[PDB]
Design a protein around this ligand. Structure first.
Ligand code: HEC
Length: 108
């Protein structure tokens, strides 16, 4: 289960079609249904300012690096049981690689 760099342009389209409805990426962006994801890489789960998380997300206690992010997005409910993120996952590894490649650039 390992991250390789991919197309940033493809993961931008995957983000907008699958994530943007619940999330934002810019600094000082609004919390919508899910939390703003700025500075997500390097931070642990459940740690964005002013967002009310489920205990499941906090208690998971994992660093959001590229591999843990990729495992989470394969199937969120399996990785964090009781998470309120209503998302089934991205099954293809290529799509997760592309999304993370985009999301690392967008969220810093
Ligand atoms: C709602 C319809 C969502 C969609 C679609 C996606 N996400 Fe989400 N995400 C959502 C919520 C409500 C939460 C909070 C988790 C909880 O149960 O408390 C999340 C959480 C995440 C996280 C973890 C953030 C953290 O721990 O600080 C990540 C990394 C995340 N979401 C990413 C993400 C991606 C990449 C998506 C599409 C590809 C996506 N989410 C869709 C709500 C919703």
């Amino acid at each position: 289960a390992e991250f390789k760099a991919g197309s940033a342009k493809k993961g931008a389209t995957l983000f907008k079609t699958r994530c943007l409805q619940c999330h934002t990426v810019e600094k000082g962006g609004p919390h919508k249904v899910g939390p703003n994801l700025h500075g997500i890489f390097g931070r642990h789960s459940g740690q964005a300012e002013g967002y009310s998380y489920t205990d499941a997300n906090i208690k998971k206690n994992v660093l959001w690096d590229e591999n843990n992010m990729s495992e989470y997005l394969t199937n969120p409910k399996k990785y964090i049981p009781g998470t309120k993120m209503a998302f089934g996952g991205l099954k293809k590894e290529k799509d997760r690689n592309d999304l993370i490649t985009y999301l690392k650039k967008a969220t810093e």
